[PDB]
Amino acid sequence: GQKFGEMKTDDHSIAMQGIVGVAQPGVDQSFGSLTTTKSSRAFQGQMDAGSFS
Amino acid sequence: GQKFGEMKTDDHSIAMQGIVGVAQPGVDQSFGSLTTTKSSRAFQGQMDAGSFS
Amino acid sequence: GQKFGEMKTDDHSIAMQGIVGVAQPGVDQSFGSLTTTKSSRAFQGQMDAGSFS
Amino acid sequence: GQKFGEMKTDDHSIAMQGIVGVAQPGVDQSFGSLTTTKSSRAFQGQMDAGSFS
Amino acid sequence: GQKFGEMKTDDHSIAMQGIVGVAQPGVDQSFGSLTTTKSSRAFQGQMDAGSFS
């Protein structure tokens, strides 16, 4: 499963939490805090190659 | 299952919580808080490759 | 699984936490803190060659 | 697995932590602190030749 | 595995910690501290010939 604490996005910031996959991952994710300001981009988790492109 | 605490979206912000999949995931999700301001975009959960494209 | 503490991105900074792979890794990741300022770019985790290109 | 303490990037600095490989490494990584200022570039971990080029 | 203490890069300095190889090394690395100033370049670890060129 995946757990999210607090994510903050300010001014056109893009943040992604979790896993994007063709298959369903069997792993656990723990997230504390993220702060994004002034149009910043953040990735938390995992990305699959097939999903990526 | 999936649990949502509090998500805040201000000024044309787009936030998605959960899993978008061709199949139904058997995982649990826990979400605390999200704050999005000034048209920011956030993803919480998982995305399937087939669903993605 | 993967654990994230706190990541800070200021002013168009791009930070990626986790593993991007064609396959699902069976490893654990621990992250404390990251601070990125003035459009800086950071990578935390692992990258797969197939995913990379 | 890989463990990250604290990495600081100031003013367009690029820092990479972890291993970029065609294959998934079976090694553990420990990281304390990194400070990069004035557009400096740092590598922590390992790089695979296939991934490199 | 590889362990990193503290590496400092000031003013466009480039520092690399770890091993860049076509194959995955089975050795342990210990790093204390590195300070690079005024655009200095440092290498810590090992480099493979195939990876090098």
Side-chain angles (χ1 to χ4, degrees):
Chain A
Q2 55 289 149
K3 300 180 180 177
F4 311 115
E6 181 180 90
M7 180 175 72
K8 180 70 180 314
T9 60
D10 288 291
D11 184 24
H12 300 91
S13 295
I14 300 83
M16 185 279 176
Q17 294 180 89
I19 300 173
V20 52
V22 61
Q24 297 169 209
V27 300
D28 289 288
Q29 180 180 271
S30 302
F31 171 88
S33 299
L34 172 65
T35 307
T36 53
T37 60
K38 294 180 180 178
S39 195
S40 298
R41 190 179 185 180
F43 292 90
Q44 270 89 331
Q46 297 180 30
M47 290 183 297
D48 160 66
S51 308
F52 183 90
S53 300
Chain B
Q2 55 288 150
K3 300 180 180 177
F4 310 115
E6 181 180 89
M7 180 176 72
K8 180 70 180 314
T9 59
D10 289 294
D11 184 26
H12 300 90
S13 295
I14 300 83
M16 185 279 176
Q17 294 180 89
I19 300 173
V20 52
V22 60
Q24 297 170 209
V27 300
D28 289 288
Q29 180 180 271
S30 302
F31 170 88
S33 300
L34 172 64
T35 307
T36 53
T37 60
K38 294 180 180 178
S39 196
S40 298
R41 190 179 185 180
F43 291 90
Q44 270 89 331
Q46 297 180 30
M47 290 183 297
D48 160 66
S51 307
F52 183 90
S53 299
Chain C
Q2 55 289 149
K3 300 180 180 177
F4 311 115
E6 181 180 271
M7 180 175 73
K8 180 70 180 314
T9 60
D10 289 291
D11 184 24
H12 300 91
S13 295
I14 300 83
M16 185 279 176
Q17 293 180 89
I19 300 173
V20 52
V22 60
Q24 297 169 209
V27 300
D28 290 286
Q29 180 180 271
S30 302
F31 170 88
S33 300
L34 172 65
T35 306
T36 53
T37 60
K38 294 180 180 178
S39 195
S40 297
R41 190 179 185 180
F43 291 90
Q44 270 89 331
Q46 297 180 30
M47 290 183 297
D48 160 66
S51 308
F52 183 90
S53 299
Chain D
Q2 56 289 149
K3 300 180 180 177
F4 311 115
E6 181 180 90
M7 180 175 73
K8 180 70 180 314
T9 59
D10 289 292
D11 184 25
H12 300 91
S13 294
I14 300 83
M16 185 279 176
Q17 294 180 89
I19 300 173
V20 52
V22 61
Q24 298 169 209
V27 300
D28 290 287
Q29 180 180 271
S30 303
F31 170 88
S33 299
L34 172 64
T35 307
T36 53
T37 60
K38 294 180 180 178
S39 195
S40 298
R41 190 179 185 181
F43 291 90
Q44 270 89 331
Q46 297 180 31
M47 290 183 297
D48 160 65
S51 308
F52 183 90
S53 300
Chain E
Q2 55 289 149
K3 300 180 180 177
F4 310 115
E6 181 180 271
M7 180 175 73
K8 180 70 180 314
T9 59
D10 288 291
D11 184 24
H12 300 91
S13 295
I14 300 83
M16 185 279 176
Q17 293 180 89
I19 300 173
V20 52
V22 61
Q24 298 169 209
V27 300
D28 289 287
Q29 180 180 271
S30 302
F31 170 88
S33 300
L34 172 65
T35 307
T36 53
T37 60
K38 294 180 180 178
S39 195
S40 297
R41 190 179 186 180
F43 291 90
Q44 270 89 331
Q46 297 180 30
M47 290 183 297
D48 160 67
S51 308
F52 183 90
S53 300

